[PDB]
Amino acid sequence: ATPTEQELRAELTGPVTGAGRQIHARGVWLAVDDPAFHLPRQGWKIHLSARPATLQETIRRMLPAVLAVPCHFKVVRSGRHLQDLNSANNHPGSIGKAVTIYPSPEDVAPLARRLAEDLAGMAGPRICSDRRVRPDAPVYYRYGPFHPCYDINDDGDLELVVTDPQGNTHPGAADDSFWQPHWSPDPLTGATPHPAPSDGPAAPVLLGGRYRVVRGLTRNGKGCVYRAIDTTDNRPVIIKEARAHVNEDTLGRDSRLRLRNERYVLHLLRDLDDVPKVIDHFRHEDREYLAITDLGALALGQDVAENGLYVADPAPPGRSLRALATALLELLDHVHRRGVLVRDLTPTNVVLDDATGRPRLVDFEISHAEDPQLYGWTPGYSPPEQERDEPATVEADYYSLGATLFYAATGLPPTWMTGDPGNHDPRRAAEVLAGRGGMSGTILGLLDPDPARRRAAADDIRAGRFTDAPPPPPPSARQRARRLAAAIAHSLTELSRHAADLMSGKDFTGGLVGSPINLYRGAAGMGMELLRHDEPSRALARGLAYWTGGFRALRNGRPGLYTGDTGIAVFIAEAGATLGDETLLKIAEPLARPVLSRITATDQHTGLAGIGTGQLLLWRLTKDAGRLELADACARRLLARDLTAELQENPPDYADCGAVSRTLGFAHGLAGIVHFLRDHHAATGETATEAALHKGCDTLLEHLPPLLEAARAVSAKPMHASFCQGLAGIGAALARTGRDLGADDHLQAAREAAAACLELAPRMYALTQCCGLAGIGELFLDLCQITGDRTYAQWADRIADLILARAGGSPEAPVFPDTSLHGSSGGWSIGTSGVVSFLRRLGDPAAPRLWLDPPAGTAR
Amino acid sequence: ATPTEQELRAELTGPVTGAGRQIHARGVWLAVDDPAFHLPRQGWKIHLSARPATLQETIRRMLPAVLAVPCHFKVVRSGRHLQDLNSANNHPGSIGKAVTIYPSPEDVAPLARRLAEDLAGMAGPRICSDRRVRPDAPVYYRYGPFHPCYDINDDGDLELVVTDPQGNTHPGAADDSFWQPHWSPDPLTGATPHPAPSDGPAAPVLLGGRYRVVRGLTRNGKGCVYRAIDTTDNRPVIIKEARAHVNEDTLGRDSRLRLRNERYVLHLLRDLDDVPKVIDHFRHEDREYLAITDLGALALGQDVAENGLYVADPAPPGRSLRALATALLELLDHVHRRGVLVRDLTPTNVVLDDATGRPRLVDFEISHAEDPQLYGWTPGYSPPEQERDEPATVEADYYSLGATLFYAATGLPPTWMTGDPGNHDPRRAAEVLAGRGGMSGTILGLLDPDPARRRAAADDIRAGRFTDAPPPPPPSARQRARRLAAAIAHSLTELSRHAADLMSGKDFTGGLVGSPINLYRGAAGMGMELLRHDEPSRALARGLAYWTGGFRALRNGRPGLYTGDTGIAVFIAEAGATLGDETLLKIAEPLARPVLSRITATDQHTGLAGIGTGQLLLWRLTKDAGRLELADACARRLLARDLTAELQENPPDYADCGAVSRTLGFAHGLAGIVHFLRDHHAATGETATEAALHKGCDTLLEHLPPLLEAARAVSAKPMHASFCQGLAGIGAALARTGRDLGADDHLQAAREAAAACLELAPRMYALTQCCGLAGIGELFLDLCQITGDRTYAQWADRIADLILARAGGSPEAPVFPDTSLHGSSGGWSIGTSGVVSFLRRLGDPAAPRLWLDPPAGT
Amino acid sequence: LAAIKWEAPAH
Amino acid sequence: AGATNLDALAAIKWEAPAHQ
Numbered sequence A: 001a002t003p004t005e006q007e008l009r010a011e012l013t014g015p016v017t018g019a020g021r022q023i024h025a026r027g028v029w030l031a032v033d034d035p036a037f038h039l040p041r042q043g044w045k046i047h048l049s050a051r052p053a054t055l056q057e058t059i060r061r062m063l064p065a066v067l068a069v070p071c072h073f074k075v076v077r078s079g080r081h082l083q084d085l086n087s088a089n090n091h092p093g094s095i096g097k098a099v100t101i102y103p104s105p106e107d108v109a110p111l112a113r114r115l116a117e118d119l120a121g122m123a124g125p126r127i128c129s130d131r132r133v134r135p136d137a138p139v140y141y142r143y144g145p146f147h148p149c150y151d152i153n154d155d156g157d158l159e160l161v162v163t164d165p166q167g168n169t170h171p172g173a174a175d176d177s178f179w180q181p182h183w184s185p186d187p188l189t190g191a192t193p194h195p196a197p198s199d200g201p202a203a204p205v206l207l208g209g210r211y212r213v214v215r216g217l218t219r220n221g222k223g224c225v226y227r228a229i230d231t232t233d234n235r236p237v238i239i240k241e242a243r244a245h246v247n248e249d250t251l252g253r254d255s256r257l258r259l260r261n262e263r264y265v266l267h268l269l270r271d272l273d274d275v276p277k278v279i280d281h282f283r284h285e286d287r288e289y290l291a292i293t294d295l296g297a298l299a300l301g302q303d304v305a306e307n308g309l310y311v312a313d314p315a316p317p318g319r320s321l322r323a324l325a326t327a328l329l330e331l332l333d334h335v336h337r338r339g340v341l342v343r344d345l346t347p348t349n350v351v352l353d354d355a356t357g358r359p360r361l362v363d364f365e366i367s368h369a370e371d372p373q374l375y376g377w378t379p380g381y382s383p384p385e386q387e388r389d390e391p392a393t394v395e396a397d398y399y400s401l402g403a404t405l406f407y408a409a410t411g412l413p414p415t416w417m418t419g420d421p422g423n424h425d426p427r428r429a430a431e432v433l434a435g436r437g438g439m440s441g442t443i444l445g446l447l448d449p450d451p452a453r454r455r456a457a458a459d460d461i462r463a464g465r466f467t468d469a470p471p472p473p474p475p476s477a478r479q480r481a482r483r484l485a486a487a488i489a490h491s492l493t494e495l496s497r498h499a500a501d502l503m504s505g506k507d508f509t510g511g512l513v514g515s516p517i518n519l520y521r522g523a524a525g526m527g528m529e530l531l532r533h534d535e536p537s538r539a540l541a542r543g544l545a546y547w548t549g550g551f552r553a554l555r556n557g558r559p560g561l562y563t564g565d566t567g568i569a570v571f572i573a574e575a576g577a578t579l580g581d582e583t584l585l586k587i588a589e590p591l592a593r594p595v596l597s598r599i600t601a602t603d604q605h606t607g608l609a610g611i612g613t614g615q616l617l618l619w620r621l622t623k624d625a626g627r628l629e630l631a632d633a634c635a636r637r638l639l640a641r642d643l644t645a646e647l648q649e650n651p652p653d654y655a656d657c658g659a660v661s662r663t664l665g666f667a668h669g670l671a672g673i674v675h676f677l678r679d680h681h682a683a684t685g686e687t688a689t690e691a692a693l694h695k696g697c698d699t700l701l702e703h704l705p706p707l708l709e710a711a712r713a714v715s716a717k718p719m720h721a722s723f724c725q726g727l728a729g730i731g732a733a734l735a736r737t738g739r740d741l742g743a744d745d746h747l748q749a750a751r752e753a754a755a756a757c758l759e760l761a762p763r764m765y766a767l768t769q770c771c772g773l774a775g776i777g778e779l780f781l782d783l784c785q786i787t788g789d790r791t792y793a794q795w796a797d798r799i800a801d802l803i804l805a806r807a808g809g810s811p812e813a814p815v816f817p818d819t820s821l822h823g824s825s826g827g828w829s830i831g832t833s834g835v836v837s838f839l840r841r842l843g844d845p846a847a848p849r850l851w852l853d854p855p856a857g858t859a860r
Numbered sequence B: 001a002t003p004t005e006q007e008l009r010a011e012l013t014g015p016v017t018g019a020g021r022q023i024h025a026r027g028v029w030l031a032v033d034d035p036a037f038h039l040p041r042q043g044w045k046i047h048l049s050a051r052p053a054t055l056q057e058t059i060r061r062m063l064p065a066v067l068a069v070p071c072h073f074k075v076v077r078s079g080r081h082l083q084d085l086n087s088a089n090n091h092p093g094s095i096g097k098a099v100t101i102y103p104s105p106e107d108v109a110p111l112a113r114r115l116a117e118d119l120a121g122m123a124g125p126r127i128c129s130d131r132r133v134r135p136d137a138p139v140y141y142r143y144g145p146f147h148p149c150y151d152i153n154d155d156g157d158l159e160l161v162v163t164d165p166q167g168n169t170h171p172g173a174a175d176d177s178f179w180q181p182h183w184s185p186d187p188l189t190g191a192t193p194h195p196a197p198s199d200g201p202a203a204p205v206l207l208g209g210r211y212r213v214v215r216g217l218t219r220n221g222k223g224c225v226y227r228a229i230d231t232t233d234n235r236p237v238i239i240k241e242a243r244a245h246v247n248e249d250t251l252g253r254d255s256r257l258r259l260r261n262e263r264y265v266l267h268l269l270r271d272l273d274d275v276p277k278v279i280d281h282f283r284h285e286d287r288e289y290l291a292i293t294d295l296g297a298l299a300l301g302q303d304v305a306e307n308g309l310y311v312a313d314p315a316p317p318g319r320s321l322r323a324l325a326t327a328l329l330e331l332l333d334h335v336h337r338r339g340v341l342v343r344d345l346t347p348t349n350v351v352l353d354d355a356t357g358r359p360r361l362v363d364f365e366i367s368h369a370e371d372p373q374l375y376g377w378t379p380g381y382s383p384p385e386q387e388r389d390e391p392a393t394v395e396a397d398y399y400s401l402g403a404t405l406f407y408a409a410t411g412l413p414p415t416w417m418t419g420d421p422g423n424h425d426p427r428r429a430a431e432v433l434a435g436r437g438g439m440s441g442t443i444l445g446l447l448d449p450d451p452a453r454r455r456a457a458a459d460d461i462r463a464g465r466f467t468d469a470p471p472p473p474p475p476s477a478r479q480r481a482r483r484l485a486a487a488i489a490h491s492l493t494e495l496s497r498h499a500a501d502l503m504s505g506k507d508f509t510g511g512l513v514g515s516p517i518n519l520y521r522g523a524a525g526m527g528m529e530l531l532r533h534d535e536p537s538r539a540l541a542r543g544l545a546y547w548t549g550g551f552r553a554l555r556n557g558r559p560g561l562y563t564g565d566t567g568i569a570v571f572i573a574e575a576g577a578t579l580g581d582e583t584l585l586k587i588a589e590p591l592a593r594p595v596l597s598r599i600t601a602t603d604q605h606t607g608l609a610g611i612g613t614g615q616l617l618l619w620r621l622t623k624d625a626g627r628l629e630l631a632d633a634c635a636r637r638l639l640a641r642d643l644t645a646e647l648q649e650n651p652p653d654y655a656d657c658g659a660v661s662r663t664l665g666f667a668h669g670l671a672g673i674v675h676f677l678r679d680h681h682a683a684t685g686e687t688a689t690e691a692a693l694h695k696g697c698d699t700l701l702e703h704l705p706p707l708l709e710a711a712r713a714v715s716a717k718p719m720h721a722s723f724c725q726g727l728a729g730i731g732a733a734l735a736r737t738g739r740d741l742g743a744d745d746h747l748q749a750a751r752e753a754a755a756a757c758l759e760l761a762p763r764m765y766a767l768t769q770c771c772g773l774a775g776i777g778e779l780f781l782d783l784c785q786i787t788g789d790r791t792y793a794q795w796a797d798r799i800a801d802l803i804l805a806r807a808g809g810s811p812e813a814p815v816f817p818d819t820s821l822h823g824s825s826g827g828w829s830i831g832t833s834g835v836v837s838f839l840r841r842l843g844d845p846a847a848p849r850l851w852l853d854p855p856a857g858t
Numbered sequence C: 001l002a003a004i005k006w007e008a009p010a011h
Numbered sequence D: 001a002g003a004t005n006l007d008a009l010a011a012i013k014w015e016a017p018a019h020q
Ligand SMILES: Nc1ncnc2c1ncn2[C@@H]1O[C@H](COP(=O)(O)OP(=O)(O)NP(=O)(O)O)[C@@H](O)[C@H]1O
Pocket: A217, A218, A222, A223, A225, A238, A240, A276, A292, A293, A294, A295, A296, A297, A299, A344, A348, A349, A351, A362, A363, A365
């Protein structure tokens, strides 16, 4: 049926006035409120699952029970709304929560049972976040908040929480997992959380079903597909999962039927050796499972990550791009000849052989056999025609092959952003794929928007006549500088937009999302950068400063510099100062003044080190003796326990996803502490801090060479060069300890780190300050400032060329993507604000680096 | 006797570093923090009471136990801090809270019992707001918040609260009595019984002397004074209470010692029948009580309230200022003959008799007997010397008498602002007093700075006929306009000050915080007023607007226009519009959009009527159709009910002035509803609203005559003329209805209302828009603009002069009292911004009244 | 000053 | 519709596993 607001409204407006509970809709809900029922702030709520046609029938079936008691409740706006809400794509844990019912605690226990028996036989998804009453009915229940209350986490972000009897917040958040609280019971059946042993040995119990053992392998949504072992064979198997009524089409085709389409296509491809075999298909209760064969250990995504790029003609044996193209199109030709379209050939759906490393196709979820056609596409890799569910064509497959080869040749996907008309411009891909891989023009033709050109390129491929096309640089700065100017202009307007969206409250919509104030994500960093610009941007900065000052008032917070209050105070004070606004200075005066004996954290991101640096920035701003006093307290409390943290990682193994950062990095490791103690020694010249400075710098140099060799490996990853986590942060710290302590050793270490970063640049995923190109370029032009080499200037220019070549919306309107890749945001560390910071200093190298160098003249 | 902060700091820092805890000092507390203890957000805390003399040893016996178990605790910073704290003039709810301890629930009851025995026999101010462990020890405990969590109340104000297992807020009122949470058990008893059991009692009483208290004549300060029936004699009497160690003087002098001072002074005045006589003096535990003959009901203050003023001798029988003056002075001289200086001779200490010889004095607590005098002074009536605690003087008493008169003759006390040098300037008093009363010059002589003049004027009274002085005349007009300019300028900069204090959080401390955002008192009103001025003030308004947008995000609200979000949205939107700021408009775009399916109030202040007026303002600003739709919803919801039938059913039930407001007045009753309905009909012109308007306007004109009867009467209470509750609001609604409906009888109602107001203006207890002169003058220039008269212009200018002459501070740098006579604030309805709105419109007649009229620029 | 009268009383 | 799920069996499914 997929009904609209009107049908649901009618069926409601009936009985609703029968008990006189006036109705209204907000966001996505249509809610009715009993006047005799006072809705509490949290408790046990009832979720009814359903789907469109079952939604209309569900409304009708449920009214009898719900109006029999005093309670409040909300209903979904429409079946299109319930379709998005039942799609895995956006929120995986809020699928099936079609109707929510809030009654009084005693009333819950019976009401749930009555609703069950009266909805017995109604069908809908399973709500993973709730317990269920009976397996014949679509009735579930949870403990959670009824009003959207938020408390702040150690990250600085705002989280939905429920409150315990001692007033302590608890993320009542729906984590696709139900947890009952210790204080209240469980209205239908009393219960408790943890077993008799307390802080004693624990052994989690996980096991397979009929005759398959499992091992993870996918995040969320339609189905957690699993790697497995076949006990009656002990062969390795792969198990695809489908959850009933998830991803239900406008024709009533749900994920299970996608799985059946996949089984059917696999049967139609039964005689191909590079396609999975279907072994078994079984359902359990309400979950369908398709058991196919294991076809290699690594996808192309993972393989290009850990085994390097696919390069022109020769290069290492496995890594020949032309070999890859030929094999892929041979296989694709086989599939097409069998009357099947892949529709979704992407680096994650090609598995290379464990021995020969030859491509094999998997995931035929949306593949085409007969002409009903399944909707579905993969951002950036699927052609736009597929975004607009147009008739599948062979040339669609050719396009996605071109994109898969693009990734194999560069290690990142073709830039695609939600809502950007430029998404599929081939010149845009040209700028990133800078002639590399040998064949380039051929793969650019595979991505050409004219389908005939894709056919011609695939012809080139089958013939063996590949096209090797190159890219050109930028006119002796004049046009490069014109491009930078326009980049900054449009980014500024985009920032006005993001700032308005922040202060108007839009993104607060997300349950469990965002930090509106701090430096890392919120207004503080945004406005700090906005200050360095024209009078409109400075007006927006003053606005953001007052906004943050008020928002911070009378709510709980954290003391961090990147997560918390110290950065907020630095921003507000700095804005007051440069604007000449004494009331902003008054507002900042009481802000970042923590206990410090409570803070156990010692890193730049959230504790002591970053707090100390921020307090020194404030002192240099305000000549406030309390601020220097706090910075000195930071150094003093940081020298107490150096030894233990070095030697506390023995059971965790190497891979160093956490270890490289949490031990050495600037954000979380001792590079930032080195940076702070250097700052403090400059400010004061204390004799004790100097010793620790030498100790930490020496240990940094001690451990650096392995990291440098790691970054220069094929196996190397962006993490290695990042400012937050890897080499860029360490280099930025050492560039300054050298200078200030007159150490040649330190500056040389910085130079080597800088160069490793230079080589990792193009492979970097994000463009942002914490995780991407801007942090690198910042180290580069830092070194420029310290050691007028001007070769570092050229390096930074390369970084900027990359950043710009990875923007959307063409040059006149760049818009730079988030850590989310597909959209932009205005945050500083993870978004466009920091990118602007870098692009700004590129023309003002004398200006200090933000949050690392102190305020200065000719730099505002 | 009183330790230093360093003696305390030594005593503490010793052991505290022994358990690894760290000291940090904030406010008036020295807080020691155990790093291994995680402080929950609410629960059972323990208070220890002590005195400067005993705080040092209290810490001593305390540290063992507190440092044994994991917990957090705070100690008052020094001995002078504890003196402030045990004085009732400071925080009456925080007397005795010398040491506060936050431990783990598991450890509360034990930790409490131990400390109790470990103290024991030590003495301190009992804590009414807590329960008590043992009646020989100074240990107490209560359930309250440990961190300032603030929720919004129906007034728009913020109050501390704790949260129940269902997440519901509950004011953890520390001031009020002890409070039992229904969800947690008393750690010591082990049960959970509430005290709402026996609130039914008509009385309980049963004093130590077996005295039956019936009602209490105030509870403020160290002690509470009660009305007693008596059981032996069964003749009515007054009983004053003293609480131990509350108000400890620097010499160790207690409230009980002050009560014994009273007993002694009364003993010395036994032969006079105009003194209460001692009758009884008893105690039990550490609460003391003194019982004296009841002289009468209604004090002089109340007398000038419920009856009238005292005027020139040929006046009503009760009313003779010279009679009151001379009677007071004969009684006073009798008292002087015995020494015994009164020191607190104030309208509240003169109780009137049914006889012609009315004046009688009833409280000589801080009176003179021996040379070690007691400190204490009542603002405005006491002389400056007494604030500085100069030795007891007969001339000081003459000053206080000259102020008691002055009040009797003007109905209000002399303007006196904490921190104001001008405080006792006698010519400033001359302005408030325009020569009304017989002994005008004598009243001013008793208030002179030189005690010789006071002595001479008292002797002049005694000698026979009194000095009759004419007003200080204003010989200038243009210079008055200069004074107006000065007032506005200085109030603007003073606003800047209040705004800075607001946004930096300075005043957020307290178990109740005034709304920092809304129109009535928070930012919205401040900024709305600041918008009408020049660019420094417009800039501050922009800052306030963004600050409000930020503060408002992700916290509780209320939909109000005056208390809540609708006025907030009006302000943010208007600031965006005038400043040319589009992001302010985007910040306002989603703000005031409540469900009207809830909202059970019909009211300009917090209900459908005010929501509607505000949404019409928003609409006219933003041209947003949802805003008009919300106005329509408000009107439809109003029309669905038949309030007027219930008015015509039972009209004058529970009739007193306060009752008038809830029915007819603009703030809470029909006048504001009518204002909204007229606005809706103006916006749309639908028939249903015009019918409703006619019904309501008629229902108003029907009941106006009795209200005008009371407003012209002897009693003449101020609430009758106030804008929020009485004639200024009704008249302001009807000026506009009679304008837009071309109904001249409406205009006539407004004119007569304005007249009544103008008669009550001088006696009004405030300069502010809600409860004082500002609303009156606002009505006056309403009528000027509507009815090109200009006689209303003169009326408004008069009100302006009255506000000015009752202002604090200098002439070129004035500050205005708020609802609390010795204080200044930026609240619009209750403070300085509203005063500014009026003083501004006085110079721009054809400019709109804020919130009452729509805006128009070009 | 001096003196006070103590009678058992009620709470 | 010869592509059917096949007999329902008793499922032991409890929680998430691994991290890939
Ligand atoms: N036959 C196979 N051999 C080897 N690896 C496989 C095989 N099937 C799946 N995989 C791996 O496990 C993942 C399974 O997910 P996949 O089959 O692509 O469906 P999916 O994750 O749901 N993508 P989609 O169907 O578009 O939502 C793939 O990304 C591969 O990494």
